[PDB]
Design a protein around this nucleic acid. Sequence first.
RNA 1: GCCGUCGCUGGCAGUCGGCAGAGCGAGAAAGAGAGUGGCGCGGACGCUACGCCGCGACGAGUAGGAGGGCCGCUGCGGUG
Lengths: 53, 53, 187, 128, 124, 147, 44, 99, 53, 28
Amino acid sequence: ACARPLISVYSEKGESSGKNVTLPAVFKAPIRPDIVNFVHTNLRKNNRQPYAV
Amino acid sequence: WRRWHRRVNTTQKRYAICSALAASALPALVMSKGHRIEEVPELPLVVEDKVEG
Amino acid sequence: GVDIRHNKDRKVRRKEPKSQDIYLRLLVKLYRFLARRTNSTFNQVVLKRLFMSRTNRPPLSLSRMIRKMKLPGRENKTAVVVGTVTDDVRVQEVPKLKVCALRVTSRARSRILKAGGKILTFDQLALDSPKGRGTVLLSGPRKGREVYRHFGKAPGTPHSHTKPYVRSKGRKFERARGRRASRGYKN
Amino acid sequence: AALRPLVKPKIVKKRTKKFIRHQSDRYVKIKRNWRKPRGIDNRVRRRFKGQILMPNIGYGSNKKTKHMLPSGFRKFLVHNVKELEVLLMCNKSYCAEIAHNVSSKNRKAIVERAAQLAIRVTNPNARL
Amino acid sequence: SAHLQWMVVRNCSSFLIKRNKQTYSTEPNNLKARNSFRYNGLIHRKTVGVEPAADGKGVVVVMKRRSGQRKPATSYVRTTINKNARATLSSIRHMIRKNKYHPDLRMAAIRRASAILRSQKPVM
Amino acid sequence: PSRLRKTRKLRGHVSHGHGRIGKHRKHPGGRGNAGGMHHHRINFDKYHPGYFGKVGMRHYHLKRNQSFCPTVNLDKLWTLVSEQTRVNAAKNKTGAAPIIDVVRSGYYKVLGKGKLPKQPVIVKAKFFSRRAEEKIKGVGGACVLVA
Amino acid sequence: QANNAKAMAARAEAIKALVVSRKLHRLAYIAHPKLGRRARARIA
Amino acid sequence: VSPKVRKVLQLLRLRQIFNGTFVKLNKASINMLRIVEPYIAWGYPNLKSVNELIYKRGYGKINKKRIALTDNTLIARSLGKYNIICMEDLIHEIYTVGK
Amino acid sequence: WRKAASLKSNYNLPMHKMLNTDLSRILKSPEIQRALRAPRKKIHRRVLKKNPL
Amino acid sequence: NFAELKIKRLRKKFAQKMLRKARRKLIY
RNA sequence: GCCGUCGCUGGCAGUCGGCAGAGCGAGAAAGAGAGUGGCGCGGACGCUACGCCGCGACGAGUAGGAGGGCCGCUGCGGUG
Ligand SMILES: [Mg+2]
Ligand SMILES: [Mg+2]
Ligand SMILES: [Mg+2]
Ligand SMILES: [Mg+2]
Ligand SMILES: [Mg+2]
Ligand SMILES: [Mg+2]
Ligand SMILES: [Mg+2]
Ligand SMILES: [Mg+2]
Ligand SMILES: [Mg+2]
Ligand SMILES: [Mg+2]
């Protein structure tokens, strides 16, 4: 959880443009499928429209 | 006046965005999400800034 | 038929964490093995404390950890808490510590390291102390919660110092009758 | 000549009659689907002799022979050729049942591909 | 890691099939289509896959290389083997045991290979 | 969610979990806090001593801004200034003590709980406790009053 | 402390100055995993 | 069953009908048997009864489980510290009421 | 991890609860493997009781 | 060298059998 | 005999293979320890660890409580 390799940048022709970017730290952050499901569950309720008889 | 909307802590919502980005860089998880990335050159896939124009 | 009672057959206790956290369960997988395949009672205690609930895993402050790690004969021993190590602003000097915790607050982390100490995870304690040797297992105050101020003899009984449930605090809110001899009685 | 499973243990059924709901023989409004009788005076609930029986975990089937078809296989519903090829390595214990709403055209492909892989099909001669 | 990735997909995966009191995995390089940590074909650094060749003759053995773990384009080395039945299996046995490449999948790979070759014989 | 609640499991069970004998009637016992000095007297006396009666003077038109007086103990006193403020003062030699202005931090009165580090300090506040001033004086500091 | 120290020396000084069947028994000896280790060597 | 009889039958471990145990007799125990008198058949067993009771129907309480005494190692691992290492030692400790 | 977020007023990546998630490397490592008792993998099924009499 | 190690194993297996043999004689 | 429940908070990461050596159920503490001097290329299954395996006991139920449903119905996000 400390490796930050170099990521290629590809040209529009689908080839490695020779440039590189170090992998951002955010891609090493903990993967929490339950924090995601909690957050997705509750945020998706926020674009609802009320219904009532 | 059913309670349609939910508050989610900013710290947790940001957590949920870090988990998503971290997961998006693992072929096993992106494959297991149904995406056909069996021939993309690399993960994460970074293309040059020309495509923005 | 056998004359027996079954109301107590099923023991109420945790066999796993209620949490769906995958990193916690990876640690439970790790310490399920160590507890089973090693005779170290320490592993059993730590394995058990990983199943416990949030209120059974109180946070351990920096000041309390420094006190208990200063007792004679606990030098160079790794402090172990199955829970969070919270910072204590009331502490002035932070001695060099080696600690293993589930979480360490952002400010507690800087103070420990700036003092020259070492912070571990529980997956690192295993590779360093597989049987828990040279460890000082520590726990936060379990009764340090506002709820326990409300448990015990009901507030309206003699010599009961239980806290009542009031919506407001002030002269008008449950202080007239039953709380002073001038109004009916007191106990 | 049909394909045979790896082993064919004897299937023992504790009970083969269905559990008909109480008083479902007296009314058409009472379907025979089981419902636990819960009336206070209900004599079926109290397990009187000579009355309708109640299901209970004691009737459970042997874990070894549970869900086993009389052929010795255990069925698994398939909707296309791709789903069929998940049984390639367990073809001596699981067979393929093709779903009802698969077109007669496509049943030829599944029933054909299954023959090649030596996977048994419970209903190969349907929608011909 | 594999164990971390298995905890994300053990019960949430487009390849996961739960039906008729069974469970299967339809992803490539799973030798038994089994929703198992051992036989999952995506989460490990070293995986073995056996498939029928594009034409119904011989098998294709897929091996995951060691370097390009995050580079799907060049991660799998595919070898076609179209010898007799006993020679096809002998190669797979050596491709696994001699290289010590996931030795615990040796018989699953050999059992899968025998099943593909059998299916390529003329039907009766 | 309603799928996780008792109602779903109570389908088919007559009485819906309220008993066959007592049933679920509308308002037995009264509405709200009825009966405090009556059929509900034990609960009130047992769990809410002091509930009934009057105590103390009335004060019409209370303005809670007049009694605003946030307090800070001495054990938290040094957090009101940065860390380098304390280390610089502790290591300097001229004897100069830093000024901690508790009003700037949003406090008015200084309380005595805790102990101070052996380091002179000048404290500014509207109010002090007697023990606060002694403890502040024991380390070589001084108490400064502001209006 | 003086009395306790004094008595400890007085206590220590005194202490320092002061300091079924023959067949079945024999077999029970031999069958003992430790003691009969030399005897079991004898029989073999 | 009355409360006092029910407790005494549990101390003897006779929680079920036609359950059997050995009881060494003395003022303490003989008076217990008098309480449960209407609920028990008891008497003095002979060497043959102790033999056949323990050989045909002898089960050990090993780690709180009912394990048949199919090997001597079962007896030795539990009662070995008392010199009881075989079914014959067990029958002698029972029949003669050893220490 | 070393540098707080620049475009969020006060935020940093969520800390890892478990730094090495490779459970197989941990378990197979020499250090843990020295502390374990030998496995007991022999199965002792029920013994049918035969009457000694 | 494994030959040296093998004898150690055998002499232990012989030792356990002799201990078992003497235990049978005691209960006899 | 079989089903389930409970208990053993029981066992299995040792599938440690030709970079090899198969065991740790056994009456009775702790090492199948490490040293220094006096031809064949071969070896079933397993492990959804929320999994698999073993052993022992037990199983009445209104009011009521709790658990699990790969029980069933309608719509939403993903996926097939
Ligand atoms: Mg019974
Ligand atoms: Mg009961
Ligand atoms: Mg109970
Ligand atoms: Mg009645
Ligand atoms: Mg009921
Ligand atoms: Mg009613
Ligand atoms: Mg109720
Ligand atoms: Mg009522
Ligand atoms: Mg009501
Ligand atoms: Mg029952």
